[PDB]
């Protein structure tokens, strides 16, 4: 379970 | 709002 | 596993908060809505974009791409910000700025 962004610390796999 | 000039096409719709 | 150069689209059903809870439990809050579990999924890079449904014929903003499974599993529903529960805040803000 994680945010579906690309760049950042809340994003999946960083 | 909500009515594009170019109509979308979708598979199965 | 890289980005598509051209814009993608996919069809998907809304869930009730009761069924969505069968997968995600207590992570589901009142300002959230789920769609998917149907063979498709949003994935990293889609964050902040639209989920739209027809109302009185017009395409209408029902969700904002928010979060879900870390492998983008097409068996699991995706989670979206619920615009109905946030739309009065939108209105105040526009009105005052």
């Amino acid at each position: 379970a994680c945010a579906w962004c690309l760049r950042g610390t809340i994003c999946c796999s960083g | 709002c909500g009515v594009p000039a170019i109509q979308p096409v979708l598979s199965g719709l | 596993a890289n980005t598509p150069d051209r814009l993608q689209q996919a069809s998907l059903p809304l869930l009730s908060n009761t069924n969505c809870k069968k997968y995600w439990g207590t992570k589901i809050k009142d300002a959230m809505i789920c769609a998917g579990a149907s063979g498709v999924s949003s994935c990293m890079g889609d964050s902040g974009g639209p989920l739209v449904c027809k109302k009185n014929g017009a395409w209408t903003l029902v969700g904002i791409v928010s979060w879900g499974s870390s492998t983008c599993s097409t068996s699991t529903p995706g989670v979206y910000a619920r615009v109905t529960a946030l739309v009065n805040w939108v209105q105040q803000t526009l009105a005052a700025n």
Binding site: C5, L6, R7 | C1, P4, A5, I6, Q7, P8, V9, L13 | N2, T3, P4, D5, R6, L7, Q8, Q9, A10, S11, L12, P13, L14, L15, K29, A31, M32, G39, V40, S41, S42, C43, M44, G45, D46, S47, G48, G49, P50, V52, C53, K55, W59, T60, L61, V62, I64, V65, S66, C72, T74, V83, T84, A85, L86, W89, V90, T93, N97
Partner: protein, 131 residues
């Protein structure tokens, strides 16, 4: 999007790409009028970033795109980064979009609208097509 399909070019005219100064795409958003975009709060947009409207193919210049600048960022003050709750942010543009065949607005609902479980809806974006 995993298991989706290419869109008809120009058919989702409210879809925008949010980019940094080097031109790297990090999130999407939606136009709601000539001056305002709706996106997610976790994206962390600031006034350094750019709003790109009217674009289809990110690898080609066969498009008339508009690069728009951000006047201010309104993050929802109930946004909780542990629960990812109240995940909404508004972007006011310092230069207005000019609406056309490939650039215009999505409707906003009433608070009172009802979208019933099991309705077929639609999602769009330029995210990963596989893990």
């Amino acid at each position: 999007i995993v298991n989706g399909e290419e869109a008809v070019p120009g058919s989702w005219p409210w879809q925008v790409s949010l980019q940094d100064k080097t031109g790297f795409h990090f999130c999407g958003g939606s136009l709601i009028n000539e001056n305002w975009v709706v996106t997610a709060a976790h994206c962390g947009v600031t006034t350094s970033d750019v709003v790109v409207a009217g674009e289809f193919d990110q690898g080609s210049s066969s498009e008339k795109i508009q690069k728009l600048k951000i006047a201010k960022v309104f993050k929802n003050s109930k946004y909780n980064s542990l629960t990812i709750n109240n995940d909404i942010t508004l972007l006011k543009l310092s230069t207005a979009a000019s609406f056309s065949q490939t650039v215009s607005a999505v409707c906003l609902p009433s608070a009172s609208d009802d979208f019933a479980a099991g309705t077929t809806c639609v999602t769009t974006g330029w995210g990963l097509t596989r893990y």
